[PDB]
Amino acid sequence: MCDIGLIGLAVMGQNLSLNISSKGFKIGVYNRTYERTEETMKRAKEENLVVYGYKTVEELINNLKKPRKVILLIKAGPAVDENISNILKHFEKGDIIIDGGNEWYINSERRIKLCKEKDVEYLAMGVSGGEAGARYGCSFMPGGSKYAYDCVKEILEKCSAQVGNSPCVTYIGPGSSGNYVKMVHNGIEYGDMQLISESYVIMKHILKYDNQKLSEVFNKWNEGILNSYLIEITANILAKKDDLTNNYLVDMILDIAGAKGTGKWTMLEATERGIPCPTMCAALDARNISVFKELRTKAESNFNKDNILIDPNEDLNDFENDLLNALYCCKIISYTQGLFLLKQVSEEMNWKLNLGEIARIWRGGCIIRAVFLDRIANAYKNNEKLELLFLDNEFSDDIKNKLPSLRKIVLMATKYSIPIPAFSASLAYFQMVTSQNLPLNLVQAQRDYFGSHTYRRTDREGNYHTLW
Amino acid sequence: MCDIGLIGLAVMGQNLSLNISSKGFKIGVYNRTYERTEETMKRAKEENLVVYGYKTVEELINNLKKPRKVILLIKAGPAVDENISNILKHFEKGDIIIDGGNEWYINSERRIKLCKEKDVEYLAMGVSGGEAGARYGCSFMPGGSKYAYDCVKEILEKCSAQVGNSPCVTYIGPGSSGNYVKMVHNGIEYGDMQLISESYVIMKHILKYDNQKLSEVFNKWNEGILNSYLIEITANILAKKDDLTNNYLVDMILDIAGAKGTGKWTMLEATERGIPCPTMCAALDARNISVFKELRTKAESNFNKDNILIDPNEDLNDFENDLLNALYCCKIISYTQGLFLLKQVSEEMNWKLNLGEIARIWRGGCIIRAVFLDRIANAYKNNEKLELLFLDNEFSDDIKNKLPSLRKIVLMATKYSIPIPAFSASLAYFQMVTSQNLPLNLVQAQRDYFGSHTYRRTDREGNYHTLW
Numbered sequence: 001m002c003d004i005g006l007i008g009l010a011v012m013g014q015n016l017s018l019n020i021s022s023k024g025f026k027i028g029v030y031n032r033t034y035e036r037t038e039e040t041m042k043r044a045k046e047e048n049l050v051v052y053g054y055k056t057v058e059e060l061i062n063n064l065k066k067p068r069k070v071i072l073l074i075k076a077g078p079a080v081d082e083n084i085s086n087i088l089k090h091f092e093k094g095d096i097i098i099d100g101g102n103e104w105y106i107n108s109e110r111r112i113k114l115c116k117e118k119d120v121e122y123l124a125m126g127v128s129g130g131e132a133g134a135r136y137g138c139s140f141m142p143g144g145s146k147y148a149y150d151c152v153k154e155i156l157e158k159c160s161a162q163v164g165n166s167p168c169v170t171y172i173g174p175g176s177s178g179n180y181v182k183m184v185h186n187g188i189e190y191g192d193m194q195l196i197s198e199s200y201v202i203m204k205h206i207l208k209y210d211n212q213k214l215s216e217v218f219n220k221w222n223e224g225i226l227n228s229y230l231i232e233i234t235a236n237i238l239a240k241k242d243d244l245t246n247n248y249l250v251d252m253i254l255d256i257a258g259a260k261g262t263g264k265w266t267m268l269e270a271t272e273r274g275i276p277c278p279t280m281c282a283a284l285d286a287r288n289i290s291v292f293k294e295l296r297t298k299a300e301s302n303f304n305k306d307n308i309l310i311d312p313n314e315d316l317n318d319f320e321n322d323l324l325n326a327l328y329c330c331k332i333i334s335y336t337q338g339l340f341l342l343k344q345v346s347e348e349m350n351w352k353l354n355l356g357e358i359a360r361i362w363r364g365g366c367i368i369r370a371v372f373l374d375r376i377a378n379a380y381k382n383n384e385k386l387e388l389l390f391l392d393n394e395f396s397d398d399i400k401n402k403l404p405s406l407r408k409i410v411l412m413a414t415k416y417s418i419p420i421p422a423f424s425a426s427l428a429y430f431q432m433v434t435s436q437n438l439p440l441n442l443v444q445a446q447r448d449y450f451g452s453h454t455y456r457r458t459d460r461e462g463n464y465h466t467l468w
Numbered sequence: 469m470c471d472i473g474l475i476g477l478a479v480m481g482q483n484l485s486l487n488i489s490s491k492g493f494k495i496g497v498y499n500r501t502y503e504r505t506e507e508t509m510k511r512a513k514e515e516n517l518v519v520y521g522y523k524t525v526e527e528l529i530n531n532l533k534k535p536r537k538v539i540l541l542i543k544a545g546p547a548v549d550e551n552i553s554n555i556l557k558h559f560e561k562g563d564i565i566i567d568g569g570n571e572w573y574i575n576s577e578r579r580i581k582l583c584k585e586k587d588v589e590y591l592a593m594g595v596s597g598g599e600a601g602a603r604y605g606c607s608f609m610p611g612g613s614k615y616a617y618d619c620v621k622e623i624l625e626k627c628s629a630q631v632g633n634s635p636c637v638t639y640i641g642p643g644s645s646g647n648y649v650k651m652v653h654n655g656i657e658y659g660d661m662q663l664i665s666e667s668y669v670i671m672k673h674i675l676k677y678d679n680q681k682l683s684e685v686f687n688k689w690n691e692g693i694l695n696s697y698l699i700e701i702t703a704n705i706l707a708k709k710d711d712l713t714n715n716y717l718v719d720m721i722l723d724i725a726g727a728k729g730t731g732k733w734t735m736l737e738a739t740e741r742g743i744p745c746p747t748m749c750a751a752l753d754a755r756n757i758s759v760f761k762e763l764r765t766k767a768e769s770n771f772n773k774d775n776i777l778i779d780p781n782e783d784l785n786d787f788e789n790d791l792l793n794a795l796y797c798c799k800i801i802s803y804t805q806g807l808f809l810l811k812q813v814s815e816e817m818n819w820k821l822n823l824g825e826i827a828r829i830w831r832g833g834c835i836i837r838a839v840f841l842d843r844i845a846n847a848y849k850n851n852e853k854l855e856l857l858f859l860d861n862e863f864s865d866d867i868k869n870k871l872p873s874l875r876k877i878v879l880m881a882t883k884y885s886i887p888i889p890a891f892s893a894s895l896a897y898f899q900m901v902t903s904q905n906l907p908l909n910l911v912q913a914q915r916d917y918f919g920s921h922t923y924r925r926t927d928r929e930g931n932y933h934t935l936w
């Protein structure tokens with residue numbers, strides 16, 4: 001009888017099935033369109049692996065060891081609820097459903113209560129790493145039933161990416177906390193990509209770097225503190241030549257960014273809970289503005305973007321190194337926002353999130369993977385209740401040393417009309433959060449003036465209304 | 469019998485009752501606690517007006533002319549639905565309920581459906597102007613039943629603020645469109661207040677203006693193109709002396725901004741629909757960051773904000789005039805965002821909003837009222853298909869002449885570490901919306917690299933996936 005089952009056999013589910021099989025576990029798979037089941041078994045025997053395929057969910061469930069465990073890798077929608085409903089007709093007390101898709105956390109909360117009515121345990125698990133990580137080692141973010149986690153943790157530990165001896169998996173917490181952490185991972189991923197792209201236009205249009213010089217700089221950055229998956233693939237992307245023309249492939253790609261929800265969800269949560277995530281908004285702003293390609297073209301035909309002619313007396317020596325420090329400084333600031341969001345939500349939901357553990361399993365497998373995440377992990381291992389990431393002693397020193405470079409980059413970009421919303425939003429966020437006194441005193445005065453909303457004073461307690 | 473009735477006698481409801489009476493209409497009022505109903509009648513006596521009070525809602529409904537019209541000014545919550553149901557137990561076919569509170573538009577849609585099942589017409593009406601506007605003239609944003617609007621239009625026209633002889637009321641559209649327009653008014657208002665507060669901190673910390681000079685500058689600006697309620701009251705606020713100390717009152721106000729939902733709702737709507745509103749995020753970011761007053765104090769103690777020492781050879785000539793032009797430029801950009809939001813939402817909701825009419829009724833009564841809004845109303849009445857506000861010929865000229873001032877302001881603020889998120893977000897929004905090519909090509913290549921999401925090409929049709 002099978003150790004675990006998996007429903008949903010796109011390339012993601014196929015690769016995870018091969019991953020589980022290659023680790024010595026016997027796995028049964030199902031997919032309504034049977035050719036995907038056939039493709040999985042074909043790929044398994046081509047790699048000398050064993051994957052059992054069944055034509056129905058009933059036959060798959062019947063071949064599962066007790067306690068029965070099934071992984072769901074189905075595109076988000078009513079097809080997930082239809083499969084859960086069908087599974088609950090054959091599962092019994094103590095069996096486990098594991099949803100591995102990018103889900104909105106409120107949806108998983110509903111499915112947890114529904115399965116619990118039949119005493120079926122539910123694990124809502126975020127997965128990061130794509131098709132490659134699904135096959136060779138990804139980052140698992142399971143949350144929900146701790147009992148469910150314990151029954152499957154050996155599979156997750158062996159199939160996840162390994163950072164030294166440490167598997168990239170942890171018990172996130174109860175309920176839908178696993179979906180929430182994976183959502184925030186993608187939100188942070190949105191920010192890193194927007195910051196990298198802004199570094200790309202800064203060197204292209206201020207330093208006049210061609211695509212070959214750009215790829216070299218990113219590869220040089222990947223050898224240092226900025227070592228990361230996104231910096232690495234960016235260096236590869238910028239050097240890629242087109243095979244339909246004689247241009248660079250990145251110059252032939254239409255600048256309309258897609259998006260599938262997780263970035264928007266992070267933003268909705270930050271707005272609703274009053275948690276400031278300015279770098280998040282900048283990344284979303286860029287993607288949402290890019291959609292209106294025809295309007296942007298007509299708008300530029302009225303507001304012509306003149307070609308950037310650099311002042312010959314412009315001090316641009318060490319500017320490339322200033323940009324390195326600024327981009328690193330912005331990652332500290334951006335991750336501070338994301339980790340602050342996770343901390344406040346954990347406190348509001350009583351999830352008891354372990355931010356050091358979350359940072360640890362983000363060191364490999366996932367998209368934001370970087371040696372940067374090992375520094376974050378160490379910061380929270382030393383202070384589990386750290387309020388803001390850059391208040392850690394080491395990160396604080398990094399900020400104090402690299403912030404002048406950030407100001408220099410924002411200055412030059414502003415002077416030459418280069419849009420850098422994520423860079424400037426990150427600098428603004430740091431300056432406001434480190435300001436004991438902000439101009440919201442005037443805002444409060446205005447609100448009392450036109451709305452009689454009252455205000456508080458600095459020198460005494462109470463709520464005061466003034467006849468201005 | 470009474471021409472109309474009003475339920476809910478806080479200061480807003482009391483003043484509107486006096487307003488309706490002062491315009492010649494016979495109005496009956498009711499409040500759950502009878503103490504407020506008496507107070508309304510005493511104040512009516514003292515102002516040589518007559519307002520009829522009733523002890524229960526049944527007597528009020530019995531004294532209404534057909535078609536019966538009742539105005540609701542109840543604090544948002546279940547009490548609104550409770551009063552609606554209580555009213556539906558006595559209204560007949562063709563009677564009208566008008567809700568005037570700051571309501572979330574989805575909740576009004578529900579109340580419109582229920583009242584329509586009882587054949588009672590519903591009017592969800594946004595109201596802006598505060599206590600003074602309720603008494604002497606506010607901006608009414610009624611949406612829903614066109615039959616209900618036509619039956620109550622003369623009361624709304626005479627009680628609204630008058631710009632010349634044009635009353636600040638219009639039929640917004642069907643459904644809850646009136647609540648949505650009022651919500652976006654507050655969103656724009658949030659942006660105006662944040663931009664003004666950044667002008668204040670720029671002059672205070674870069675130019676070293678004290679409060680007397682600050683008040684003089686805003687008064688000076690109120691005489692020119694920036695003539696507006698918010699600029700005017702800002703001048704009064706900055707000059708206001710505290711009577712408990714010998715300091716300026718605004719300096720004794722704790723910098724923790726309140727917020728009661730409408731600004732947050734505007735951002736939630738923009739985020740969910742993918743409509744870029746970066747200036748709204750900056751306004752909300754500033755208010756949300758201000759709440760963390762204790763963390764901000766601890767943060768500055770570690771990140772000491774040095775005294776802003778201005779370079780003696782810094783060219784600050786015409787800097788005050790650059791700030792004037794920059795603030796006016798940001799208002800153009802911010803209203804471009806908010807009016808684009810209204811346009812896109814009108815399309816998606818099939819509301820057929822008249823942006824020229826909405827701008828017209830925002831010229832008086834409401835908080836954002838300004839001669840600026842007459843220019844906006846004229847721009848849309850000249851071209852009802854205008855897409856972006858700053859694409860109007862005269863607004864386009866303003867951007868071209870004033871955008872260099874905005875760059876100069878952002879440059880100086882960046883150099884001297886002044887957080888100005890709304891100014892920088894406005895400038896970034898303009899530079900992105902007017903960019904034919906944005907670095908989202910790199911983002912699209914990354915998403916195809918790690919997620920196989922495919923990309924589009926600039927030179928041919930189709931969706932392409934590259935083995936990078």
Ligand SMILES: O=C(O)[C@H](O)[C@@H](O)[C@H](O)[C@H](O)COP(=O)(O)O
Binds near residue numbers: 128
């Ligand atoms: O962690 C990952 O492996 C990716 O982030 C994964 O979740 C997927 O690629 C998302 O769809 C990307 O997000 P967008 O499609 O919204 O850019």
Ligand SMILES: O=C(O)[C@H](O)[C@@H](O)[C@H](O)[C@H](O)COP(=O)(O)O
Binds near residue numbers: 596598
């Ligand atoms: O248009 C108006 O007359 C005001 O905007 C009114 O709606 C009220 O004063 C809001 O409560 C202000 O908004 P906040 O309280 O969220 O700042």
